[PDB]
Structure 1
């Protein structure tokens, strides 16, 4: 029933006596049980792909069959875990081996098989008809998340003849007996799923609810809807780590799945050392972020197939967590590396190249992968709802954006947050080049603004035109100097500078400017536009703007200092203070005109 090796060639192996094997089964080739997958079947012999190094193999070694394609186990215990590209626990492996290597031919359960979990029955009873995707019990996973639900895997129906009652169990105790034509069906606290097949869902919806990150510029001018895609350039000096950290700590999501898809290694060490120290404070300083995140690490040494399947694994995990009714936020690291791995695999298979040497799959693969994102209502009885929002990170070949990867990604995604290094030295620490970055979810977000903040769109637009006008104005200012410019032009210029240095720039470490909520930013841009338009109106009827600036230097300083105002104090008393400041500015301008 086993298979004897018949040939070997680097990473290529040919089995024998293989009858009754699918085209993508998994096989435990070798005495050490190296993992592999069948590719081509020709009668009895079948080509096999290996992951580890094949040195030392010998003809006649038995070959086994797993019985499924590449799959990932899902269940309680994912949180606080650090995984390889192919669902391999690294902490447990290191502890078990006591070495500092990944000893080839090592197999340990993806999830711990010893920790006892306290299960609580759901809402069904014996003899009740059931359908796939229906919740039938919860589990307390952490103080942060305590409602880790238990589903019935899709493609499974029937009636339940026995359900275990409350108690404490491990992951190897059948807690349900679904009866069908064959009553063989048993179920435990976990199950598996092929990675390459998208999870079934009742129906997709239209994402409209905004995703707020806590930054000012992001949600002010280039918002991302909670459920959509986005892209940000990958550079060394840009310092994207700030964006990822802020998204992890201050966003309104409920589960983060960071994916390292091939890095220099040392960067992986840095991020792994850093994450367990980031702290969030909601209803008290809930110490870790690891209690809300699972991380997939893939250094360059990792096997090519593992380095390639990383994003598929991550997105599958995200979809699983979405179907529980929670909100998820995937974050890739370098899609360029994933494309590199895909091209390397294609080349090793010896297939026809395409544009710039890449294969022909890239377009379709990326399109499908991105389409896997979105917002939908889960598949089950309770009718919960979730959402997924991928955040890609494209790195170029050598800076140029002519590569197919960048073109396809930009064509697919909807939001781009351009980062510039030049701002780094000037320390606009949120280093967003406002002349390039853009968003396309405004048309939907207006249907939320009107319900909550009707004036937001006109204000954000107004500052968009203000910034464009100021940057254009400076061009001719250099040519002819400010001398030949009217007072209105100088007003535009200086208000643009004030906005640049207050509204956009953000320390990110001060207790007050670390995390700016929505209403606070609402008040800020309202106040800034009011100041500018009131000043220009006052100048319109006739007045030397120099004298006006001399009179209202205090008002300008007050509006600037309003940014230093500490939020998290009343969250409506702040609104009262902002109203007081606005009225004070109005009456000060009125008196100044006199």
Structure 2
């Protein structure tokens, strides 16, 4: 079925005047609210919300009212707060009782600065989920190019009940993955100017595991038939696979296993966990989860063999 059957679109452009630009997302959020009032779960994408803020700035300049920051109206924070808070899981007004939800997915756009602009500064305090761009990753053509250090999602504690019913290990695995990425990021920062000579086996494992994560879990082309849409169960399975690889290597080098030899001896397992992202989600959760269980068992037994 066409997405357009589940889609209505507002098509304001740059040629359209500033007033229409300002009112475009207001019309869009009102439509989203109307469909939420029927119990429908509505997603609203406001691309280039920074252009909306620019429309507000131009209207303010036309009115001559004194702005704040550099050029933007001071009520920018209040208006984005109201617009963002128009979203949320809600109980419909009338009867029978319903439960809709409007999810704002708004796109800011950098203007030379990444976060010093007022629109992002207000949004960070307003919005609950932030996916900040990583300019260095884009410079290296790594997609998606979001930053894993400054981006945040406060729903991680709320989703604990959802995870405990379907994927109970998801929160702790995500925490461990974030810890690995942060530790390896600080270690890369300290090693760029020194060199990898002095790093211990644990440090090398952390660096290479985080590199594997960045190159085979965070990275999605989004165009191939595989991982165009990675389902939550496939994502959880690869999370546990990568964490199993990391902690298996760490436990192996907790013994006398030199990791320089261990990497060569378990290159097969490293390639397997890297290519796990190539599983086709269309196969269904059952068989692909069986594949991931097979991969985990192979990883564990191979690391046990290589430890001795």
Deviations 1:297-346 (A, max 9, x none): 22233233222211211111110011111111111122333233333334
Q: CA 1:289/1:533 → structure 2, altered by over 3 Å: closer, same or farther?
A: same
- Following superposition, the deviation at residue 400 of structure 1 comes to 5.8
- Following superposition, the deviation at residue 352 of structure 1 comes to 4.7
Q: CA 1:535/1:389 → structure 2, altered by over 3 Å: closer, same or farther?
A: same
Deviations 1:189-246 (A, max 9, x none): xxxxxxxxxxxxxxxxxxxxxxxxxxxxxxxxxxxxxxxxxxxxxxxxxxxxxxxxxx
Q: CA 1:590/1:494 → structure 2, altered by over 3 Å: closer, same or farther?
A: same
Q: Distance in 2 between matches of 1:400 and 1:493?
A: 27
More strand per residue: 1
Q: Distance in 2 between matches of 1:327 and 1:445?
A: 17
- Following superposition, the deviation at residue 354 of structure 1 comes to 4.5
Q: CA 1:473/1:292 → structure 2, altered by over 3 Å: closer, same or farther?
A: same
Matched pairs, number: 308
Q: Distance in 1 between matches of 2:153 and 2:44?
A: 19
- Following superposition, the deviation at residue 446 of structure 1 comes to 1.1
Query: What TM-score, normalized by structure 1, do the two folds share?
Result: 0.49
- Following superposition, the deviation at residue 356 of structure 1 comes to 3.6
Other structure's SS at 2:153 match: coil
- Following superposition, the deviation at residue 349 of structure 1 comes to 3.8
Q: CA 1:350/1:448 → structure 2, altered by over 3 Å: closer, same or farther?
A: same
1:441 to 142, 155, 167: 155
Q: Which residue of 2 aligns with 1:339?
A: 53
- Following superposition, the deviation at residue 523 of structure 1 comes to 1.0
Q: CA 1:389/1:543 → structure 2, altered by over 3 Å: closer, same or farther?
A: same
Q: Distance in 2 between matches of 1:431 and 1:386?
A: 32
Q: Distance in 2 between matches of 1:426 and 1:397?
A: 20
Q: Distance in 1 between matches of 2:193 and 2:21?
A: 53
Other structure's SS at 1:294 match: coil
Q: CA 1:334/1:560 → structure 2, altered by over 3 Å: closer, same or farther?
A: closer
Gaps of 5+ in 2: none
Query: What TM-score, normalized by structure 2, do the two folds share?
Result: 0.91
Q: Distance in 1 between matches of 2:266 and 2:157?
A: 38
Q: CA 1:545/1:320 → structure 2, altered by over 3 Å: closer, same or farther?
A: same
- Following superposition, the deviation at residue 389 of structure 1 comes to 0.8
Deviations 1:440-486 (A, max 9, x none): 11110112111211111111111111111112222333343222121
More moved, 400-409 vs 460-469: 400-409
Q: CA 1:356/1:493 → structure 2, altered by over 3 Å: closer, same or farther?
A: closer
Preserved contact between residue 255 and residue 307 of structure 2 (Cα < 8 Å): no
Preserved contact between residue 37 and residue 100 of structure 2 (Cα < 8 Å): yes
- Following superposition, the deviation at residue 522 of structure 1 comes to 0.9
Q: Distance in 2 between matches of 1:365 and 1:423?
A: 32
Other structure's SS at 1:388 match: strand
